[PDB]
């Protein structure tokens, strides 16, 4: 079915939310993630 319309079957909304009730137990409990991706090579390095 064409999805020029906003709602309806076979035509959904792309973003999707998810809840953090405090009574949840370590299965959906929140976790802050910071990833530090590195590049190491003989190069004009700036961070030491």
């Amino acid at each position, epitope marked *: 079915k064409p999805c020029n319309g*906003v709602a309806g*079957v076979n035509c959904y909304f792309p973003l999707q939310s998810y*809840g953090f*009730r405090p009574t949840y137990g*370590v299965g*959906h*409990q929140p976790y802050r993630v910071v990833v530090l991706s590195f590049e190491l090579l003989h190069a004009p390095a700036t961070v030491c």
Partner: nanobody
Amino acid sequence: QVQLQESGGGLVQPGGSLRLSCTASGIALHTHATGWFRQAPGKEREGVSCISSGDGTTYYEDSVEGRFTISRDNAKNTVYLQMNSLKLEDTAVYYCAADPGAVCHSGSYYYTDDDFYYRGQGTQVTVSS
């Protein structure tokens, strides 16, 4: 603009059977958790059943065990409440509600607390002679 519609209800005889259906327009199923809550005049609203997000673990209340069944069809994006062998105290209006995540019985939390994000208008069912 997400709207949940319910179809079914009406006058049904005690000892009968019926199939309520709830359909989501904006959101899709098998990602959300869908529950049913019933309300009658003179008392406060109490839940009926729920389906979680993945596959679906069916939870039922104490008063509706063994009699009521719940199913979810992703081919029509519709949740189906099949109720059979109705007693005279089941005269109520039913609402379908969708919540993000696997909200029904995850950790120490349980879906008796009515805090679902999406709601509906509900349909009335009446058992009488």
